[PDB]
Design a protein around this ligand. Structure first.
Ligand SMILES: C[C@]12C[C@@]34C=CC(=O)[C@@](C)(CCC(=O)Nc5c(O)ccc(C(=O)O)c5O)[C@@H]3[C@H](C[C@@H]1C4)O2
Ligand SMILES: C[C@]12C[C@@]34C=CC(=O)[C@@](C)(CCC(=O)Nc5c(O)ccc(C(=O)O)c5O)[C@@H]3[C@H](C[C@@H]1C4)O2
Ligand SMILES: [K+]
Lengths: 412, 412
């Protein structure tokens, strides 16, 4: 029989902050983390801005030596993971190390380090490829390195489901606990795809905003003048824990993870169906998993990427799932502020959903000046809205038509 | 309480053949699939051979247009998937499409597409980056594209756990079925890392055999003169199916998937502990999952990568788990013949384990001329061995210390 799963620790790097509290302060203030990119020359690119992590100091977590062997996406994932475990208060011992695992994923992974080694290969030659190229670039090395540093011997894996990664990572980790394969999991996602191939690749697909003159206004989910997503970097990690395990050690419980849904659109490689039918199936799976009446959902943290086709598909899906209740719940996209953290989006947005529960407040959709046709729900335009929130749902969708939904609830 | 999971279809591309029967014929014959690499110039590299897929014809599966969008690892994964679905006889309909999902993974993913996009990027900037670069290179696109082509709407995801990927993919897919989230899953892995970055990266880590003079002798698991793994390419896919679902449509059942285990070494980024303690925990977890006493295991398809440290760690783990029964079972490494398919290794080796059950024969470890110190189990040296096999176990281990074990049994 299925065990209950709660959240006892969280950690983050985002364009708004180097930890959870600083990021969340930005969220509730409606602050943008988007700016012209400084770390490379994007003069030849159609998009020249995004959400960078500012002032990260890897040496708070790892030595210079260890850090230079690892791509930035790995460093970011480790930072968020270490923060979450610290936040949870958990002490790893021989008595529990086999019962604590890790599932930290990425969508794009080590593209940046691969691009740099590729430069070495072609400009210098093959003997300039790093000895640490493979372990420092592969997606599972967040889980790997975290387990090595903390001594975690339970299930150890990584998902890669593009922009759905972080949501799937958390949901599948919760299944491990619910079914008895672990008592504790560290789960989430990390990304740093701000390199030539990243900006260039998403740009070639015409998926990015090109509002170069006003980067903070670029990400504008459901607004009539939206023109694509804003690429952002960072990481999110949660400590998921079996309920009785948490209670026995006197852990602080932020919220309960009650539902997880998955689906496939089976429609198109890079676009959802106009009616968001796949997203609707995914949400219904998550609601049924949680044993809920859809009218119990108070807050939705949308995927809200600011693409023309994506944002309206999600409205359609929400209307299909919730009926008239779609007008009672609040739904917002925190990507309005953070931009799109790709494989880490679902992780940071899970955190934001948990914090919406702790603080009884719906984060805003900033930049929502003129809602587009049919976008007539309570989208929490401009300003955070204090309200009752007993149940929060968080959606992620990805290229390939891969969908995930998490459902969190206040714990008492 | 948990539903039973059986295998009803299989598909493969390997260095031994373009499908399962051809590959398996090679396995039973002790044939090597290793040769000098022909598709690129490795004259200045320290390793110039590996296991290539010979004569793959993508136009049996995809249009030229579709094929030009997709990295070779995705093409290979799709080929194996299409073969497995055909082999299963499953008819996808509106009545079942929400019950059929896909979990096909990769260890390193789109290295070749990245490498090809690199060259232009550094000489002439991002102008020539394809609009399909991102969807055609991300690891979840095997799952994505397969779902789109066949209309599969069930759980849709991808693992990336380096050399463990194929095993974890099959195991986690089995859980989806056992727990009622799907009735059918296509699962496995694919890889095509034979490029400058791949050969150069693994070569920089000093992980590859450099036996260029005798490529077919290079892969020699447990032999005293082994000197690293042999890099190979391909894919494996299984159709996993709930037992009653299979019975109701009169499916041919190859075998039952009874156990899945996972662990982490929490030891080192690129090496196992000398005693294989992580691998031992993983195998025990899989046996506990299956409700089997270690004395019930008849055949182990080892990870057997032909590395100095890897091979002996696995012997130690087997001795620890199985005690005196370690002397009764047979264990072999088919990587002696196929080389190391990385993220696809656990998929093709799951298939080989299923076929060992069908045909009651332990595949050989070829090249085992002089077993190393302590390598004194029945390692099926040189020649296939007909014997009773009721229970077959298959191990995969990966950089980061990530471990997976599958347990299959004859179905009557
Ligand atoms: C063929 C076209 C049609 C096109 C036209 C209008 C659009 O709006 C876009 C730009 C984006 C559609 C979309 O939102 N896809 C989408 C998705 O399915 C799942 C997740 C995300 C995410 O960012 O996490 C995402 O971005 C599409 C893309 C690129 C190209 C232009 O496909
Ligand atoms: C730092 C060192 C020490 C060194 C010394 C002797 C060795 O034998 C090797 C070559 C490989 C160890 C090993 O087997 N790792 C290993 C593993 O843990 C899991 C999976 C696989 C697989 O191939 O699927 C694998 O390859 C190691 C590697 C590279 C480098 C040289 O680490
Ligand atoms: K979300």
């Amino acid at each position: 029989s299925r065990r209950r799963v709660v959240i006892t620790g969280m950690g983050m790097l985002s364009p708004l902050g180097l930890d959870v509290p600083s990021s969340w302060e930005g969220i509730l203030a409606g602050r943008s983390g988007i700016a012209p990119i400084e770390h490379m020359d994007l003069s030849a690119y159609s998009t020249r801005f995004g959400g960078s992590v500012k002032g990260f100091n890897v040496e708070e977590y790892l030595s210079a030596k260890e850090a230079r062997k690892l791509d930035l996406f790995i460093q970011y994932g480790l930072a968020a993971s270490f923060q979450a475990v610290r936040d949870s208060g958990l002490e790893v011992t021989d008595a529990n190390r086999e019962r604590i695992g890790v599932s930290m994923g990425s969508g794009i992974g080590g593209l940046t380090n691969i691009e740099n080694n590729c430069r070495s290969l072609f400009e210098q030659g093959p003997r300039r490829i790093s000895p640490f190229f493979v372990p420092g670039s592969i997606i599972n090395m967040v889980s790997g390195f975290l387990s090595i540093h903390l001594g975690l011997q339970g299930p150890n894996y990584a998902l890669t489901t593009a922009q759905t990664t972080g949501t799937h990572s958390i949901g599948m980790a919760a299944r491990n606990i619910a079914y008895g394969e672990a008592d504790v999991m560290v789960a989430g996602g990390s990304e740093m795809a701000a390199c030539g191939l990243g900006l260039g690749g998403f740009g070639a697909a015409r998926a990015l905003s090109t509002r170069n003159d006003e980067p903070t206004r670029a990400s504008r989910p459901w607004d009539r003048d939206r023109d694509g997503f804003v690429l952002s970097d960072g990481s999110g990690a949660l400590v998921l824990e079996e309920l009785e395990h948490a209670r026995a050690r006197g852990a602080r419980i932020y919220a309960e993870l009650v539902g997880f849904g998955m689906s496939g659109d089976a429609f198109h490689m890079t676009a959802p169906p106009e009616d968001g039918a796949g997203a609707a199936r995914c949400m219904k799976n998550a609601l049924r998993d949680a044993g809920l009446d859809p009218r119990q959902v108070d807050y939705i943290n949308a995927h809200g990427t600011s693409t023309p086709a994506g944002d309206i598909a999600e409205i359609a899906a929400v209307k299909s799932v919730f009926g008239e209740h779609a007008h009672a719940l609040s739904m917002s996209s925190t990507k309005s502020m953070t931009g799109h953290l790709l494989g880490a989006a679902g992780a940071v947005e899970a955190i934001f959903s948990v914090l919406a529960l702790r603080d009884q407040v719906a984060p805003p959709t900033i930049n929502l000046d003129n809602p587009d046709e049919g976008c007539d729900l309570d989208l929490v335009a401009h300003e955070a809205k204090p309200r009752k929130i007993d149940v929060a749902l968080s959606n992620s969708f990805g290229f390939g038509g891969t969908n995930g939904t998490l459902v969190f609830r206040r714990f008492a």
